[PDB]
Ligand binder design. Sequence first.
Ligand SMILES: *[C@@H]1O[C@H](CO)[C@@H](O[C@@H]2O[C@H](CO)[C@@H](O)[C@H](O)[C@H]2NC(C)=O)[C@H](O)[C@H]1NC(C)=O
Ligand SMILES: *[C@@H]1O[C@H](CO)[C@@H](O[C@@H]2O[C@H](CO)[C@@H](O)[C@H](O)[C@H]2NC(C)=O)[C@H](O)[C@H]1NC(C)=O
Ligand SMILES: *[C@@H]1O[C@H](CO)[C@@H](O[C@@H]2O[C@H](CO)[C@@H](O)[C@H](O)[C@H]2NC(C)=O)[C@H](O)[C@H]1NC(C)=O
Ligand SMILES: *[C@@H]1O[C@H](CO)[C@@H](O[C@@H]2O[C@H](CO)[C@@H](O)[C@H](O)[C@H]2NC(C)=O)[C@H](O)[C@H]1NC(C)=O
Ligand code: NAG
Ligand code: NAG
Ligand code: NAG
Ligand code: NAG
Ligand code: NAG
Ligand code: NAG
Ligand code: NAG
Ligand code: NAG
Ligand code: CA
Ligand code: CA
Ligand code: CA
Ligand code: CA
Ligand code: CA
Ligand code: CA
Ligand code: CA
Ligand code: CA
Lengths: 415, 415, 415, 415
Amino acid sequence: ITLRADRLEMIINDNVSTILAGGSGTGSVTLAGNSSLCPISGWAIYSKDNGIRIGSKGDVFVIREPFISCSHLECRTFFLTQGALLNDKHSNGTIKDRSPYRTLMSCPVGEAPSPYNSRFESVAWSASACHDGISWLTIGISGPDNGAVAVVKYNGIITDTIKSWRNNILRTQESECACVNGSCFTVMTDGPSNGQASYKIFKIEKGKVVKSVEMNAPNYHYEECSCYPDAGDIMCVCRDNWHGSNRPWVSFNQNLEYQIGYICSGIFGDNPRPNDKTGSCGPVSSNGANGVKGFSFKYGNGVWIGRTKSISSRNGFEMIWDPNGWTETDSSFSVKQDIVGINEWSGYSGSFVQHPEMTGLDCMRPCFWVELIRGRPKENTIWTSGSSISFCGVNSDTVGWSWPDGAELPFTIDK
Amino acid sequence: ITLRADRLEMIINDNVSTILAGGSGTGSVTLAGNSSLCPISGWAIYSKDNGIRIGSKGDVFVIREPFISCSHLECRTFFLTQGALLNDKHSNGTIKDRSPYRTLMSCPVGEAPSPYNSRFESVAWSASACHDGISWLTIGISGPDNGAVAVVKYNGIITDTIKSWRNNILRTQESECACVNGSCFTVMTDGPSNGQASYKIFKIEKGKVVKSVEMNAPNYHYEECSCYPDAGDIMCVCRDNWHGSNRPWVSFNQNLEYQIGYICSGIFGDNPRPNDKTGSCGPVSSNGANGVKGFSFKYGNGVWIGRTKSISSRNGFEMIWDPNGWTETDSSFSVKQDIVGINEWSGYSGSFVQHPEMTGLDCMRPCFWVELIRGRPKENTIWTSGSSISFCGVNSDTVGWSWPDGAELPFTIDK
Amino acid sequence: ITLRADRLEMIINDNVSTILAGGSGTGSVTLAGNSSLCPISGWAIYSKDNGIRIGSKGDVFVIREPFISCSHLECRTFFLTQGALLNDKHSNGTIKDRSPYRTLMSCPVGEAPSPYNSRFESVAWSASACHDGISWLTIGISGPDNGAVAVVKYNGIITDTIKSWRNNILRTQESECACVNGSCFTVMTDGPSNGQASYKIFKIEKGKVVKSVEMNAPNYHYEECSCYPDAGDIMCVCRDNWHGSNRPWVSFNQNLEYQIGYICSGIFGDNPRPNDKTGSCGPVSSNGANGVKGFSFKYGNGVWIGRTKSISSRNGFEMIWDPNGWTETDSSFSVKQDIVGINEWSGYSGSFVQHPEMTGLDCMRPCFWVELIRGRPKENTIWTSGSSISFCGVNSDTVGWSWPDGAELPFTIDK
Amino acid sequence: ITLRADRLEMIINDNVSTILAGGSGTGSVTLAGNSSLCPISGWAIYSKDNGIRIGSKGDVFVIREPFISCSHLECRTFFLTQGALLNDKHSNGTIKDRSPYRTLMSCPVGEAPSPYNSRFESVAWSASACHDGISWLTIGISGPDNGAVAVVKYNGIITDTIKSWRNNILRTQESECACVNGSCFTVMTDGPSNGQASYKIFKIEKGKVVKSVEMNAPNYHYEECSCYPDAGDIMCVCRDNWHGSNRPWVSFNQNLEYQIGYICSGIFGDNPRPNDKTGSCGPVSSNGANGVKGFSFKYGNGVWIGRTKSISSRNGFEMIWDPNGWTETDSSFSVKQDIVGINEWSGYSGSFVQHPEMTGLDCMRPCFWVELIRGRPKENTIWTSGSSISFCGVNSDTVGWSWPDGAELPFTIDK
Ligand SMILES: *[C@@H]1O[C@H](CO)[C@@H](O[C@@H]2O[C@H](CO)[C@@H](O)[C@H](O)[C@H]2NC(C)=O)[C@H](O)[C@H]1NC(C)=O
Ligand SMILES: *[C@@H]1O[C@H](CO)[C@@H](O[C@@H]2O[C@H](CO)[C@@H](O)[C@H](O)[C@H]2NC(C)=O)[C@H](O)[C@H]1NC(C)=O
Ligand SMILES: *[C@@H]1O[C@H](CO)[C@@H](O[C@@H]2O[C@H](CO)[C@@H](O)[C@H](O)[C@H]2NC(C)=O)[C@H](O)[C@H]1NC(C)=O
Ligand SMILES: *[C@@H]1O[C@H](CO)[C@@H](O[C@@H]2O[C@H](CO)[C@@H](O)[C@H](O)[C@H]2NC(C)=O)[C@H](O)[C@H]1NC(C)=O
Ligand SMILES: *[C@@H]1O[C@H](CO)[C@@H](O)[C@H](O)[C@H]1NC(C)=O
Ligand SMILES: *[C@@H]1O[C@H](CO)[C@@H](O)[C@H](O)[C@H]1NC(C)=O
Ligand SMILES: *[C@@H]1O[C@H](CO)[C@@H](O)[C@H](O)[C@H]1NC(C)=O
Ligand SMILES: *[C@@H]1O[C@H](CO)[C@@H](O)[C@H](O)[C@H]1NC(C)=O
Ligand SMILES: *[C@@H]1O[C@H](CO)[C@@H](O)[C@H](O)[C@H]1NC(C)=O
Ligand SMILES: *[C@@H]1O[C@H](CO)[C@@H](O)[C@H](O)[C@H]1NC(C)=O
Ligand SMILES: *[C@@H]1O[C@H](CO)[C@@H](O)[C@H](O)[C@H]1NC(C)=O
Ligand SMILES: *[C@@H]1O[C@H](CO)[C@@H](O)[C@H](O)[C@H]1NC(C)=O
Ligand SMILES: [Ca+2]
Ligand SMILES: [Ca+2]
Ligand SMILES: [Ca+2]
Ligand SMILES: [Ca+2]
Ligand SMILES: [Ca+2]
Ligand SMILES: [Ca+2]
Ligand SMILES: [Ca+2]
Ligand SMILES: [Ca+2]
C-alpha cells in the first residue's frame, strides 16, 4: 500500500511538472535520432512563402538563408535579416554582410517573414538552429571579423559562447544543426574562404559545448554545412569555397570520431561548376572556387543531389537520384525531378529532417529548402532578398515543376 | 490493491499524454459523424469578414474560395491566394489560375485574410480541408496540368500523395471534406471540364489514402463537390460543368459504396441556368455548361438549395426550402430566405457542418458560406478577390436581408 | 479500497476533461455574482488605447462603442466596426449606422483595434457581450429595421436567436451583459426612439434564452442599458431618448421580478440635459429627448454618476459621488473626479465589473469605460471613430485629470 | 488506506488548479531571489530589435525607455509610448513628456515595438515592472505633476495606488523592480530634480504595498533607479540629477533596512561627467547636474560600470570592470568591453537579471539593456525614439564591438 501510494505521488508530481513545461512549449522526451533515412522515390512540395511578392506591399523583412528546422510540434523558417523591410530605404544592400544590425529570427513555415509574425532569436550574421525534442538550440555569431563570438542559446537563454580561434570570420552552417539522443552537433569554420582554413565539430548538450574536435582535413575546404542525423551518426554535406566543384562531406558519431571525403559523382553539386563528366573523390578544382550552400542525402552508395540547373549562376534547381554517386565517378544518374526552371532565380539550399517523434514514421524523413534570391547583384535593385520553397521526401507519387519566386522587380523603392 | 494501483498508473500516463497533445492543439476523440442533420427553419448569420473593404488599406491577400471548416475547438476560413496583396501590382490577374505561386492558407472565421493572421497550409491551386476530431487534414494540389499531385497533410505533416490518373487537371472540392469515425472523405475529378471526365471517391485515415473508388457515372459531370456527413454516410452536391443546370450528387457509406443522381427540383441550383420550370432527375442541359461551386442539404425528399438570384451571372444569393425537391420535378417551393440582393455580387458557396462534439447538440448542424467576388472580369480592375459571409441553420426565428461585399471599386492600384 | 480507487478514477477523468477545456480557454466554474459592490473612494485609470492617434498611420478599424467585459482570465474591448480602416475611403460615414457591413469584434484592453489583433465575434449593428465564468456569451443584432434578429453565441457557437417583436429596430445594451450563477441577463428595446417603446429583460443560460419578461414601464424609455450584478441581483442604468434628462433604471432578480424608476439626483446624468437643479424621481423632460449611453453605480441611497461635463454636447467627462442621489432630488454632491476636460471630446460610456473569481477580492469591483468620439458631425472629416479610456474603482488614493483622445484632425483621407 | 487516498485527492485537486493557472500563464512558485550574482568575465549580446530601422516602413511605436524584465518563462521589453507611430504626424515631439497619452506597453525581447505585437500594461509616463515567479507586477504613474498616482497592477488587475506625497512629479525606476521570495521592491522619488528631493522604498506583495520607508539621504539625489536582487537583499544604482557625476546607490533587506552611498570609483558613471580622475564616496559635483539612467553591478569591493563613452552627451557605451571601484577612488580599471562606438548614439540603460528558476544556474545572472536614442534634440527630426540592444553576463569568451541603432535620419515625416 505504501509502495503503490508513494509511486502514484511521484508520477503525479513528475507528470504535472512536465505538463507545466509543455504549456510553455517545452518538450518532455529527447529525439532518439537513431533511425535510418526513409525510403523515398521523390519530393513532394511542403511550403512556399511568396515572401517577396507579399513584401511588395506588406511589411516584410529583407532576408537571407531562410532555413527550416522542426520541433516535435512545429516546423519553423529561421532567417537572417539586416533589420530592414522590403521597399524601404534601409534595405539598401551597400551595408556589409557582417553588420551589427544582422539578426537571426524565425517564423512559421510558409508565412512571409514579417516583424508582426517573427520571433527574435539572436544577434547573428551567421547562424545555426535545431531542436533536441525539449527546447530550441540557437547559435548566433556576431562581432568583428577578427574575434567573432557565437552566442549559444537553449530555450532562448544564453548557455555558452564560442569565440573565433583563428581570428578570421568564425562562421557556421546557415541551416539546422543535427540532434541525436539529447546531443546536438554543428560544424564551424574559421579562416580563409579562398584557401585552407580550420574546421571544428561541436557537440552541444542543453546549450553547453561538451566536446569539440578540430578536423584534420588537409586540402579540403568546409563551409555552410548541411547536417542531418542518420542511424545515430551525423552526416554533413558542405560547400568547398576554395577549389571544389563537387561537395565535401564529413560524418561523425556521438564521440566526434569523424570521416571525410568528397561526393564522387560526376554530377557536380556546387555552383559554379563544370558540365558533368567523370568526377573525383577529392576536390574538383575546375570552377571550384566560390560556391553555394547546398546539401545531399546519402543512401548506401547512392546520393540524392539537389543543385542549381545553371553551371555558372544561381538559376534553376533540380533533385537528382544517382544510385552510385556517393562513391563512383561517372556522370550517369537515374532520376531527375525539376524544382525550379533553368531561367528562374534560385540560391542557397539546405537539408532538414522530420524525426519519428513528430511524424510517427519508423524512419528519418529527409526534406530540403531552397532560397530564391532576388535583386542585387543580378538585378537592378538597391536590395537583395530571398523567398523560399521546401519539399519533403516521400515514397509515393510526385511530380517535377517550377516553383519560382514570382516577384516583379524593380520595386517602388528602387526608383 | 495491485489491480487498482496499476489501473491508476495507466490512467495518469494516458491522460497526461493526452493533455500534452491537447496543449499543442491536437484533440483526443474522433468525431462520431453518425448523427442526422438538425431540424431547422432558417439561417442565422454567423460571420462576415469584410476582407476587400479592409484590404483597401490593410495588408490583405487577394483570395478565392474562402471555405470554412471547424475543429472541435474552432472554425477557420481556408482560402487560396496567389501570394499577392490587395492594392499591390502583384495582384494583377493575368497570372494563370493554376500557378506555382498559389497556396492554401487559413485564418480565424470573420477576420480579413492577412499575412499577419493567416497560417500556411499547403502549396495548392485546388484544395480541400477538414478536421477529424484529432487533427487537420489538408489536401493541396499543385503541379502541371498533365501530372498534378495532391499533397495530403495530417496535422501539418505530409502523409500521402495522389497523382493525376488522367493527366488532365486533377482537382477537388474547394470546400471541406467530410469526417466520420476517424475516416475522412473527399471527391476528386480528372479530365475535361466540358465533357465526360473521371470522378474518384477517396477514404483517408490519419492522412493516408486507405481506399478509393472510381465512380461509374456515364453522362454525369462532377466538380467542386460540397460534401457533408449525415447519419454516418456522406452526401456530396456538386457542379456539372458539362451539361447540367441542376446539381449532381453522390452519396456513399464508409466502404465507398455509392449512389448517384441529380437534384430533381425545377428550382435549378447552378449558375448559369434556365428560369425555373419542370426539372429533371438527370442533367438539365439548357444553359447547363459552365457552372458555379454550390451546395444543398437533403432532408428526406426535400432539399435546402442555396443559389444565386441571377440565372445568368454570379449575382445575389438565396436559400430555398423545397419540401419535395430532392426527388420531384416541380418548381414550387415553400420558403425563401434572402442572403444577398439580386444586384449584388456573389460567387462560390459551400457547405460546412458543426459536429455534436463541438455544439453539444444531438444532431449535425448544417452551415454554409458564400464568396462575394469582386473585380475582373465583371469590373474594371486588374485583380479579382472574394470576401465571405456565412450562416448556420437554426430552428428558431431568422430573417432575410442582403449582406453584400461593400467595397468601392476601382482601388488605387487599378489607376 | 474499491471506494477510494473508484473515487480517484472519477477525479482524474473529470479534472483531465477540465484541463483540456481550459487549454482551449474555457473556464471550469461559473461566476457566483452574489457579492456586493466594493467600497471605493475614487477611480484609478485602467486603460487607454490611443486608437485614433495610432490609426493615423497604423491599420486600425473605424469603431464605435468600445465596451469592456472580462472573463476570469482577461478583459477585452468589444466594439462595432463598419469593416473599414482609418484613413481609407471606406471609412466615409455616409453609410447608414445599421448596415450589413457592421460587425462586433474584440481585442485585448488598451490595444488599438486592428484587423491584426482583433477577433471576430458576430455580425452586428447593436450588440452585447459578457462571460459567465466558463465561456463568452455574445449577442449580435443584424437585419432590416422591420425584422432584426439578435444572434446569440456561446463560446463562438450559435445557440439562439431573438427576433424583433415590434418590427421597429430591435436593439440592446452596447456594453456588457451581467452574469450571476451561470445565468446572464440583458435588456433589449423594440420601438420608437422618440416615444413610448417596448422593453424586455432576457435571462440566458449557455446561450439559450430560458426566460424573458416584458417590462410594464408606462411613460419610461429604456435604451442602451449599462447592467451590472450587485449582491446576486442585476441593476441597469439606461438612456431615456424620449423625454428624460436623468437616467432610467431597472433592477431585477434571477427570476426577472423587476423594479423601475429614475435616478432622483438633481445632478442630471444624461446628455443633453439642463443645468443642475432640483431633480425628479420620474423623467426630467427639459432637454430630455435624445441622449447618450451612460451608467451609474448605486451604493445604498447614494450614486456614483459618470457624465459629460457639457450639458449640450458630448464633451468632457466626470465622476460624481452623490451620497443621497439615488433617492433624493437635491443637486448637491460631495466628490467630483475629473476624467476628461470640458473642452475635450467624449461620448458613450458604460459600466463593467471585475468579479471576485478574477480579482481575489470579496466584493464586486466596479469599473467604467469612456468612448472619445472624433470626427463627424462635430469635425470636418469624412469619418467618425472613438478611442477609449477606462477606470476601475478603488478604496485608495486617486486623482482627477484629463485623458483625452489626442488625435490631430483632419486626417490625410479627409483632404 | 484512508490517509494515502485522501493525500492523493489533495495532490490532484491542487496540481490541477496549478495546471489551470499555468495555462493562463500564471506561475506556481515564487522566485527565491537568495542567490549571489554569477561569476562573469564579460558580456554576450542577447538582443537587438532594430526598432527604428524597421519603423521607417513598418508600423512601430515611437518609444522611450525599452527596459527588459523576465518571468520564469520569457523576457519582455517594456516601454513607454505617446501612442504614436514612427513616420506619422502624431510622433511630433512638442507634446510634453508627462502627457495623458503616455502608456506603458511591452513586447517580446528583440521584436520591433508595434501595435500588432505589443501588449498594453498601464497608463504611465513613468513606470516600473517585474515578475515574482507567479505574475507580472506593473507600476504605471500618470496624472498631474502636483498629484500623480502610481497605479499598481498584479497580473493585469489593479491592486493598489500610491499618490505623490510631495506634489512634485512622483516618478520611479524606468527599469524592472526586484523580487525576492514573493516580495517586490522599487524606489520612487517626489520632489525637485535640481535639488534635494524625497526618496521612498516600497515593498509590494501580490501588488499590495505592505511596507514603505522614506530614505534619510541628506545631500543625496536618487532618480531612475536600476535595482537587482543579490543574495536576498536588493541593490539599486541610480541617477543623481542634482550634483553627482558618479552614481548614488541604496541597498536594503526585505525589512527595508537600508544603506546608502555613492560609487567611489574615479571611473565616473553618469552622463554628463568629468574626465576620469580621483573620485569620491560622496557626490562628485563637477558636471554633476542632469544625468542619464544607468546601472552598475557590485561584486565585493569591485564594480561593473556601464556608461556612455562621451563625457558630455549620450554617445557610445562601454562596460568597465573596476576591481576595487565600489569602495576606492582611483580611476584605474582592469577590463573594458566596447558596446557602442564613441560616435554612435546611445542613451538610457538599466539592469535586469535572470533568476535560477529560469536559467537552471545556481546564481543570479546579471544583464543589461541600452536604449539608442535617435532624433530630437540632437538630430533634425520632429520625433524622438529609442531602439534597444541587450547583453547578459557570462563566464566564457566574449568580445567588444559596436552595435548601434543604424537608422538613417531624417525620415519621410520630417520633410
Ligand atoms: C545606397 O547606399 C549607397 C552607399 O551608402 C549610396 O551611395 C552613397 O551615396 C552617398 C550620398 O547619397 C554618397 O556620398 C556616397 O559616396 C555613396 N556611396 C558609394 C559607395 O558610392 C546610395 O545612394 C544608396 N542608394 C539609395 C537609392 O539610397
Ligand atoms: C497586368 O498584366 C498584364 C499581363 O502581364 C500586362 O499586360 C502586359 O504588359 C506588358 C508590359 O507592360 C506587355 O509587353 C504585354 O504584351 C502585356 N500583356 C498582354 C497579355 O497584353 C498589364 O500591363 C498589367 N497591368 C498592370 C496595371 O500592371
Ligand atoms: C462620402 O460619401 C458620400 C455619399 O456617398 C459622397 O457623396 C456622394 O458622391 C457621389 C459621387 O461622388 C454623388 O453622386 C452623390 O450625390 C453624393 N452623395 C450625396 C448624399 O450627396 C462623398 O463624395 C464621399 N466623400 C468622399 C471624400 O469620398
Ligand atoms: C510640431 O508641433 C509643433 C507644436 O505644436 C508645431 O509648431 C506649431 O505650429 C502651429 C501651427 O502649425 C503654430 O500655430 C504654433 O505656434 C507652433 N507651435 C510652436 C510651439 O511654435 C509644428 O509645426 C509641428 N511640426 C510638424 C512638422 O507637424
Ligand atoms: C501538487 O500539490 C501539492 C500540495 O497539495 C504540492 O506539495 C506539490 O508540489 C504539487 N505538485 C507539483 C508538481 O506542483
Ligand atoms: C532508438 O532508440 C529508442 C529510444 O531510446 C528505442 O526505443 C528504439 O528501439 C531504438 N531504435 C533502434 C533502431 O535502435
Ligand atoms: C510520469 O512520470 C514518470 C516518472 O516519475 C514517468 O515514468 C512517466 O513516463 C510520466 N508519464 C508521462 C505520460 O509522461
Ligand atoms: C454515435 O456514436 C457514438 C460514439 O461512437 C455513440 O455513443 C452514439 O450512441 C452513436 N449514436 C447513434 C445515433 O448511432
Ligand atoms: C484517461 O485514459 C484512459 C485510458 O488509459 C481513458 O479510458 C480515459 O477516458 C482517459 N480520461 C480522459 C478524461 O480522457
Ligand atoms: C456566494 O456563492 C458562493 C458559491 O456559490 C458561496 O461559497 C459564498 O459563500 C456566497 N457568498 C454570499 C455572500 O452569499
Ligand atoms: C476534479 O473533479 C471533481 C469531480 O469529479 C471535482 O469535485 C474537483 O473539484 C475537481 N478538481 C479540480 C481541481 O477542479
Ligand atoms: C534559497 O531558497 C530556496 C527556496 O526557499 C532553498 O531551497 C535554497 O537552499 C536557498 N539557498 C540559499 C543559498 O540560501
Ligand atoms: Ca566551390
Ligand atoms: Ca552515377
Ligand atoms: Ca452547369
Ligand atoms: Ca417542389
Ligand atoms: Ca435623454
Ligand atoms: Ca445629493
Ligand atoms: Ca548627474
Ligand atoms: Ca579602480
